[model samples]
Target chain A: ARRAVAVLRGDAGVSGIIYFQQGSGGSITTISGSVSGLTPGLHGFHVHQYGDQTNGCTSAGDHYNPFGKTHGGPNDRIKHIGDLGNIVAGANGVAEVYINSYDIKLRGPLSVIGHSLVVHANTDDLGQGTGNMREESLKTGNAGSRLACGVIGIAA
Target chain B: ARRAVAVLRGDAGVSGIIYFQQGSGGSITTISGSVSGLTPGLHGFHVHQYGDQTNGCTSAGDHYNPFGKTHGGPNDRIKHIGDLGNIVAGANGVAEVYINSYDIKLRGPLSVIGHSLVVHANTDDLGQGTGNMREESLKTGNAGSRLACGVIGIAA
Candidate 1:
């Protein structure tokens, strides 16, 4: 099938423009990009397993917690599938988000191959506490820190 | 079953896409029905928790995270449940994304109702280290902040 697409870039500078569409009516992923010098407002993107990418982005670790739960968002009945909950870049910096994962995959390693795509500074209120911060980092639901990252595989 | 609600349109517009799904999925709550207007970027969406909107984007939301973990990519600690990570839009104007959840209506201010999903005009260095003037927000690992966030979920 000519539809099994893939592309990854988040190193070389560390902004973002991701595209990994794996064809059919079942595997879709697209995240356009933009984010300026910093200190504007809002940030936190997801999809991180282990693409390595030379450990540039903490080796893509933390969120994506397999059933261990506690990290919140995505409706948090118990959250942590990488936690893709936080985006609002617009003062002039820019932001464009798109995410769809039926369970994520690229070749396997649990899929989302080699993995890496992280962004966070603030806003993940999805953990809902009332604000202020601090308390073991708001019980992991803080959604703050790890401002930007990228690593999605299968395309060289 | 179809209802993954997280959408916004102004006047106090804010919903940001929520997800959760076990089976019986279908989505795309309002693509042509005109949810006010959309056209920018970061629109590759989801909103699946179950109300079965005909599985349009798998009803959105469930795969991003509700704590099943394993899809690992956004920032894996354990990985997958849904892994939410990307959302940025601007210049083009209409960058819309939606999905809803209050623990899938199980109720009680449940969670995944909100915390972070920001990709505004700037800021997202979440990778720490520091950097982003706009090289796609510095190759996706900047993760900083536009503010208004706490963390993921299930802590409050």
Candidate 2:
């Protein structure tokens, strides 16, 4: 029962609950949730380094890259652990994205607890932006501003 | 199975986790946790209205007074629901206070989820102050600056 949840709240009328449930005996974790009041199209979703929301979501800090890797998609061979690619919101401004991953664990040094989940204002370039965007893309995927966020905690 | 947790982190070297768990069929909830790096004295602890940590703990807003009551102690006949009284820190700068309350719940309209917990720099006064303090006491128990805070979330 390694389950966790982040009840995200944003200053701009964003609210949602993101669930993180690990597999019975493995690292596979199913990240599921519903968020409303987002602009239609893709939004970057990732685990952040800290849960400190001291300036809205700006103070949550960088990505949850315990391994010190560059920004990339969840499936990329070389990528930060926080990178979960992207999620799309419907025309009604709701996103119920279902994502399953094998890199994240609920326990150990790489655990997501005590950290945070951040929903970005823009699409995650997945570390594949071109030319001028390459540098920032590798570092932050140029995900723009942090819209909503919540600290990850143990859940039943 | 109604429970919640707040993983508090502060800018002034405070860190802790507070747990809220209710009885099987009642409103009684036990608030238990360990906090380190606090001053050797009593500190005010309360559940704040918002989980918005946009300025350290300052942005979390006032004490959660869902019933529109004045500030008071845990046993006061009339008091804000967020009031859990006070917590004492040891000489070693650690506190493990055990507080059982019937004023808070983890579910329903008065739920503490999606909110924040704040530890203050001064005593709660518990709506029992004198002279100049009496005025502010009823409003906030005259609790000093917010030292640490974290959003309460559903826990397993």
Candidate 3:
């Protein structure tokens, strides 16, 4: 399958590009990217619904949950389609993100072609924040303001 | 289907919200909303990729072009799915908008929920600026800055 790409953008010090590559079959997709200007630690990452940026990160829609599923960790059976857990930012405020998603698709049925990718300001509780399963967690993983976002499109 | 809504934002002088409602049996999502703080006259409107507002509008990936088509007007048969052409703002800097989008879907197979809606600062040129067919026109309609944006979400 053709690889897809996205350029994440946000505040003055944040920037990155995400690449999507589907696996041999049709199940898993490899997500890789490097982001700069983070606070260093874990940040919630996922695919959002809209590619809109009129009002910046605040203009984005909810998570890309086509099946209407609740939010969860990347490995959970109950995670939202957009949910990819978190990316660890090292001490230099750069996150060399790499993940193998078992549920996302870069093409066909649930192709992410026209959607947006968001890197949040806080950690994605994975729908189980503080071991209490908070409401925002189930809906947004309790991730704070978006640090950056980019649309997923076809790659050369 | 149920009506969806979006908030359009940009700079300090631009703001508004858009509504989407599809016709029966799918296809044709009604685009309606009110925007303020715009320069009187025409401005480009579209659904862009990546709701990422990290650096405001600049971080947005690009126009939401799922079909790999050239930019065109809302009435053109060969336009990109992200194309909505231009919207006219009145002298009061407000646009009471109402449109019927024949190619958009609010749910299932091409749903606009997880995507974004953008309002450009200039005329889209509809891929035909001054009838010269400029380079940027075919790609971005030459629409200038994004004033505001919001994600489309399910409404009550």
Candidate 4:
């Protein structure tokens, strides 16, 4: 299969590029990328439903969930296919993320092509917390607003 | 034991595809898909308990909430296995979604291979809203009419 790419764009000075490669036999996909201009903490990263950048990041829709599962860490046994956990930024406002997922795909109905990749404004919290924090985290990772977004497309 | 696909069918112009992948060691399952020809906005998408689409979408039954949790996003900690959240479409009429999950499976009792994939007319709202939206969204995301559907099947 062809490699994929997403060019990040957003306010708050967020920027980066994510690269995707499907694993042999189609059982998984690996993602690698770097982002800068963050707040020197943990940030949420995910693949959204659309490549449409109109209306900015909201147009990307929610995290990709095909089996109707709940939110958890990327290796939480059960989590969103697009859920890659958190990316931690250093004091210099830069962060790097690399992961291999058994759930992600590069082709078929589950293809990430024509979708959106995003960086959240706050920490993902990984759906673990208390009170409203827990509720919001479960629902949206309480990840705040979109710091950056990119459309996943065929690599040049 | 392997990958699967669902060909969603509904009213005229309502058509799409859904794909599934089971993780190793019975760990988790990931889902993803794309649809076109709907009014611009968010639409409810999910996997129902039954794959029997012979009676159209409704025959698939309610969201596959085996844990009996309320409706929520794919990343929520306390939610039904079928609470996949929503898919957003651009003004041009197209939407795409992807997700990884642990609550459902491709084998055994929770296997989704024989289930169904449904797309609702309105937004899923992720079971979060006020008044009627709150009630129905929790029960159904108040996603409106069943626009399209498909039965899950093993990939070739």
- Worst lDDT run of 10 residues, candidate 3 chain B, spans B50-59
Rank all candidate structures by their DockQ, best first, as comma-separated numbers: 3, 2, 1, 4
Individual DockQ of the candidates? Answer: 0.03, 0.07, 0.10, 0.02
TM-scores of all candidate predictions against the true structure:
0.24, 0.57, 0.64, 0.50
- Model 1 DockQ reads 0.03
Residue-by-residue lDDT tens digits, candidate 2, B1-156: 566677788898888987878888965888898888899999999988766554567767788998899899989989988888889999998989699887888756577765688898889999998899898999899879888888875554
Compute the lDDT of residue B7 as modeled in candidate 4.
66
The regions of model 1 sitting more than 4 angstroms off are: A1-16, A20-37, A40-66, A71-79, A83-118, A122-138, A141-156, B2-156
| Candidate 1 structure quality by residue, lDDT tens digits, B1-156 | 321222221222322322333123322121111122333444322212321111122222233345543333344465332233334445544333333322232122222222122222233333232334344322333333221111121110
User: Local error of candidate 2 at A133, Å?
Assistant: 29
Chain A TM-score of candidate 1 vs. true chain A: 0.31
Local distance difference test values of all predictions, in order: 0.39, 0.82, 0.77, 0.75
Q: Model 4 off-target regions past 4 Å?
A: B1-156
Worst 10 residues of 4 chain A by lDDT: A48-57
Candidate 2: C-alpha lDDT: 0.82
Backbone clashes in model 2, listed as residue pairs: A54-B54, A155-B155, A155-B156, A156-B155, A156-B156
Candidate 3, chain A: TM-score? Answer: 0.93
For model 4, how does the per-residue alpha-carbon lDDT over B66-103 read when each residue is reduced to its tens digit?
A: 78889888888977787778888888888877777887
What is the clash count of model 4? 10
